[PDB]
Enzyme design. Sequence first.
Site, PDB file in Angstrom:
ATOM      1  N   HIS A  83      18.182 -21.915  28.393  1.00 33.51           N
ATOM      2  CA  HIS A  83      16.950 -22.696  28.215  1.00 33.51           C
ATOM      3  C   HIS A  83      15.941 -22.461  29.313  1.00 33.51           C
ATOM      4  O   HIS A  83      14.752 -22.269  29.011  1.00 33.51           O
ATOM      5  CB  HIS A  83      17.274 -24.191  28.040  1.00 33.51           C
ATOM      6  CG  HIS A  83      18.167 -24.462  26.855  1.00 33.51           C
ATOM      7  ND1 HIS A  83      18.788 -25.687  26.691  1.00 33.51           N
ATOM      8  CD2 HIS A  83      18.532 -23.649  25.823  1.00 33.51           C
ATOM      9  CE1 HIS A  83      19.498 -25.582  25.567  1.00 33.51           C
ATOM     10  NE2 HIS A  83      19.413 -24.364  25.039  1.00 33.51           N
TER      11      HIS A  83
ATOM     12  N   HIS B 269      24.676 -16.748  21.044  1.00 30.94           N
ATOM     13  CA  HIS B 269      24.609 -16.090  22.365  1.00 30.94           C
ATOM     14  C   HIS B 269      25.401 -14.784  22.440  1.00 30.94           C
ATOM     15  O   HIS B 269      24.893 -13.813  22.996  1.00 30.94           O
ATOM     16  CB  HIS B 269      25.034 -17.050  23.483  1.00 30.94           C
ATOM     17  CG  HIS B 269      24.184 -18.283  23.582  1.00 30.94           C
ATOM     18  ND1 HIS B 269      22.809 -18.211  23.796  1.00 30.94           N
ATOM     19  CD2 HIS B 269      24.555 -19.586  23.566  1.00 30.94           C
ATOM     20  CE1 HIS B 269      22.393 -19.469  23.873  1.00 30.94           C
ATOM     21  NE2 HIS B 269      23.409 -20.329  23.746  1.00 30.94           N
TER      22      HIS B 269
ATOM     23  N   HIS C 271      15.619 -24.197  17.421  1.00 32.09           N
ATOM     24  CA  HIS C 271      16.398 -24.098  18.650  1.00 32.09           C
ATOM     25  C   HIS C 271      17.059 -22.722  18.802  1.00 32.09           C
ATOM     26  O   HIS C 271      17.105 -22.179  19.913  1.00 32.09           O
ATOM     27  CB  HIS C 271      17.484 -25.183  18.738  1.00 32.09           C
ATOM     28  CG  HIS C 271      18.089 -25.196  20.112  1.00 32.09           C
ATOM     29  ND1 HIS C 271      17.429 -25.779  21.192  1.00 32.09           N
ATOM     30  CD2 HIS C 271      19.173 -24.521  20.583  1.00 32.09           C
ATOM     31  CE1 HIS C 271      18.164 -25.495  22.259  1.00 32.09           C
ATOM     32  NE2 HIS C 271      19.232 -24.758  21.935  1.00 32.09           N
TER      33      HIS C 271
ATOM     34  N   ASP D 164      16.797 -20.113  21.858  1.00 32.28           N
ATOM     35  CA  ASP D 164      17.946 -19.509  22.553  1.00 32.28           C
ATOM     36  C   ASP D 164      17.821 -17.985  22.603  1.00 32.28           C
ATOM     37  O   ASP D 164      18.092 -17.381  23.650  1.00 32.28           O
ATOM     38  CB  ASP D 164      19.232 -19.831  21.803  1.00 32.28           C
ATOM     39  CG  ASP D 164      19.798 -21.211  22.122  1.00 32.28           C
ATOM     40  OD1 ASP D 164      19.388 -21.815  23.165  1.00 32.28           O
ATOM     41  OD2 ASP D 164      20.631 -21.699  21.324  1.00 32.28           O
TER      42      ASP D 164
HETATM   43  C1  24G Z   1      28.821 -40.144  22.511  1.00 33.83           C
HETATM   44  C2  24G Z   1      29.419 -39.012  21.735  1.00 33.83           C
HETATM   45  C3  24G Z   1      28.529 -37.794  21.729  1.00 33.83           C
HETATM   46  C4  24G Z   1      29.154 -36.580  21.094  1.00 33.83           C
HETATM   47  C5  24G Z   1      28.496 -35.304  21.544  1.00 33.83           C
HETATM   48  C6  24G Z   1      29.317 -34.537  22.524  1.00 33.83           C
HETATM   49  C7  24G Z   1      30.103 -33.414  21.902  1.00 33.83           C
HETATM   50  C8  24G Z   1      30.505 -32.384  22.899  1.00 33.83           C
HETATM   51  C9  24G Z   1      29.331 -31.675  23.522  1.00 33.83           C
HETATM   52  C10 24G Z   1      28.901 -30.509  22.730  1.00 33.83           C
HETATM   53  C11 24G Z   1      27.883 -29.652  23.427  1.00 33.83           C
HETATM   54  C12 24G Z   1      27.793 -28.259  22.841  1.00 33.83           C
HETATM   55  O1  24G Z   1      27.461 -28.338  21.456  1.00 33.83           O
HETATM   56  C13 24G Z   1      26.768 -27.362  23.518  1.00 33.83           C
HETATM   57  C14 24G Z   1      26.818 -26.011  22.876  1.00 33.83           C
HETATM   58  O2  24G Z   1      27.804 -25.321  22.800  1.00 33.83           O
HETATM   59  O3  24G Z   1      25.649 -25.714  22.295  1.00 33.83           O
HETATM   60  C15 24G Z   1      25.615 -24.542  21.462  1.00 33.83           C
HETATM   61  C16 24G Z   1      24.607 -23.586  22.078  1.00 33.83           C
HETATM   62  N1  24G Z   1      24.999 -23.106  23.443  1.00 33.83           N
HETATM   63  C17 24G Z   1      24.364 -22.330  21.087  1.00 33.83           C
HETATM   64  O4  24G Z   1      25.575 -21.755  21.119  1.00 33.83           O
HETATM   65  P1  24G Z   1      26.053 -20.220  20.348  1.00 33.83           P
HETATM   66  O5  24G Z   1      24.786 -19.488  20.205  1.00 33.83           O
HETATM   67  O6  24G Z   1      27.188 -19.630  21.095  1.00 33.83           O
HETATM   68  O7  24G Z   1      26.530 -20.748  18.915  1.00 33.83           O
HETATM   69  P2  24G Z   1      27.039 -19.983  17.606  1.00 33.83           P
HETATM   70  O8  24G Z   1      25.957 -19.108  17.102  1.00 33.83           O
HETATM   71  O9  24G Z   1      28.369 -19.408  17.888  1.00 33.83           O
HETATM   72  O10 24G Z   1      27.193 -21.170  16.541  1.00 33.83           O
HETATM   73  C18 24G Z   1      28.154 -22.246  16.643  1.00 33.83           C
HETATM   74  C19 24G Z   1      28.869 -22.398  15.319  1.00 33.83           C
HETATM   75  O11 24G Z   1      27.916 -22.516  14.232  1.00 33.83           O
HETATM   76  C20 24G Z   1      28.194 -21.535  13.250  1.00 33.83           C
HETATM   77  N2  24G Z   1      26.925 -21.109  12.599  1.00 33.83           N
HETATM   78  C21 24G Z   1      25.911 -20.489  13.318  1.00 33.83           C
HETATM   79  C22 24G Z   1      24.772 -20.074  12.730  1.00 33.83           C
HETATM   80  C23 24G Z   1      24.591 -20.255  11.318  1.00 33.83           C
HETATM   81  O12 24G Z   1      23.604 -19.916  10.669  1.00 33.83           O
HETATM   82  N3  24G Z   1      25.643 -20.874  10.672  1.00 33.83           N
HETATM   83  C24 24G Z   1      26.806 -21.334  11.238  1.00 33.83           C
HETATM   84  O13 24G Z   1      27.643 -21.935  10.582  1.00 33.83           O
HETATM   85  C25 24G Z   1      28.952 -20.424  13.970  1.00 33.83           C
HETATM   86  O14 24G Z   1      29.712 -19.623  13.075  1.00 33.83           O
HETATM   87  C26 24G Z   1      29.806 -21.244  14.941  1.00 33.83           C
HETATM   88  O15 24G Z   1      31.016 -21.727  14.357  1.00 33.83           O
HETATM   89  O16 24G Z   1      24.038 -22.831  19.789  1.00 33.83           O
HETATM   90  C27 24G Z   1      25.021 -23.700  19.179  1.00 33.83           C
HETATM   91  C28 24G Z   1      24.505 -24.049  17.803  1.00 33.83           C
HETATM   92  O17 24G Z   1      24.503 -22.921  16.935  1.00 33.83           O
HETATM   93  C29 24G Z   1      25.247 -24.943  20.039  1.00 33.83           C
HETATM   94  O18 24G Z   1      26.307 -25.696  19.455  1.00 33.83           O
HETATM   95 ZN    ZN Z   2      20.193 -23.645  23.308  1.00 34.02          ZN
HETATM   96 ZN    ZN Z   3      23.261 -22.229  24.159  1.00 32.96          ZN
END
Ligand code: 24G
Ligand code: ZN
Ligand code: ZN
Length: 266
Positions: free
Chosen positions: A73, A252, A225, A229
């Site tokens: 970010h 990522h 978002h 990224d």
């Molecule tokens: C009080 C209680 C509160 C509860 C809250 C707390 C919970 C714990 C905290 C969580 C914090 C994390 O959440 C931070 C964190 O990790 O934030 C990441 C961020 N860095 C970036 O991560 P990254 O780029 O690596 O993600 P992926 O592309 O790999 O997608 C990910 C999955 O989505 C699928 N996908 C992807 C694209 C699509 O078109 N379709 C589809 O299905 C894909 O297959 C895979 O299974 O973006 C992600 C989004 O996409 C964020 O979640």
């Molecule tokens: Zn992000």
């Molecule tokens: Zn991220």
Amino acid sequence: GLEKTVKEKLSFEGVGIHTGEYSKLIIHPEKEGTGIRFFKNGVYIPARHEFVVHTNHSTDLGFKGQRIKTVEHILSVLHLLEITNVTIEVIGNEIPILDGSGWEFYEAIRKNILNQNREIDYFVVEEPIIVEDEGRLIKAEPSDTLEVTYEGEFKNFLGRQKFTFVEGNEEEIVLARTFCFDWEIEHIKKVGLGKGGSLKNTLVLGKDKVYNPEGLRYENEPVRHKVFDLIGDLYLLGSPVKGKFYSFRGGHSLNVKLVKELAKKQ
Ligand SMILES: CCCCCCCCCCC[C@@H](O)CC(=O)O[C@@H]1[C@@H](N)[C@@H](OP(=O)(O)OP(=O)(O)OC[C@H]2O[C@@H](n3ccc(=O)[nH]c3=O)[C@H](O)[C@@H]2O)O[C@H](CO)[C@H]1O
Ligand SMILES: [Zn+2]
Ligand SMILES: [Zn+2]
Ligand SMILES: [Cl-]
Ligand SMILES: [Zn+2]
Ligand SMILES: [Zn+2]
């Protein structure tokens, strides 16, 4: 465009989304030709792809035993504003997540731009390239302006949606927050991540619902978002970028894969 730094030291502080620890940032002005670098415990970590150490749930950098998590970010905001010379001192192990978007960084840095005495040496995409990984794809091709499209295909209510950023529309993506699905929480917590996650810094989506009481800022806030990224990860090429990009389900890991292939080629 001219190289740029900040007019004065800028500070930000808060919890890291993954570590759940408090960290502080100090953005220092730097002279022409310095580049973007982080600084932690006496070590400079350039904001370049050679220093990427982890990409699964954040983009993390490291050098000489010092590591910094979640640089995507702050790097996206610096890329969008063409800030080219700056030192990001980190007192802690991760960049503060703040509200999960780039808004606070963008508003503060935008008001403190200092044009410098060099023309920017842009990373210019010279020919088409496609990178793929199990259903995910990212395409890059030449363009005089930075143009980035993300197309998501989600298993929940979001379905298939896309969003395109073009230069001049920075305000359309800097407010879009990070998000996760309720079914992902178990895994993220199990691998020692998401320790600082809350509804104040992450959108949490279910099969049919948005848990955050404020709801979504935009119906396509998640794909805005993902564009934000990708612009942060592209800054790992080490210079502001000119090219037209299309990401289908990228993240990522694939963004860094594309960056390394582009760097190798040129
Ligand atoms: C009080 C209680 C509160 C509860 C809250 C707390 C919970 C714990 C905290 C969580 C914090 C994390 O959440 C931070 C964190 O990790 O934030 C990441 C961020 N860095 C970036 O991560 P990254 O780029 O690596 O993600 P992926 O592309 O790999 O997608 C990910 C999955 O989505 C699928 N996908 C992807 C694209 C699509 O078109 N379709 C589809 O299905 C894909 O297959 C895979 O299974 O973006 C992600 C989004 O996409 C964020 O979640
Ligand atoms: Zn992000
Ligand atoms: Zn991220
Ligand atoms: Cl993992
Ligand atoms: Zn110029
Ligand atoms: Zn994982």
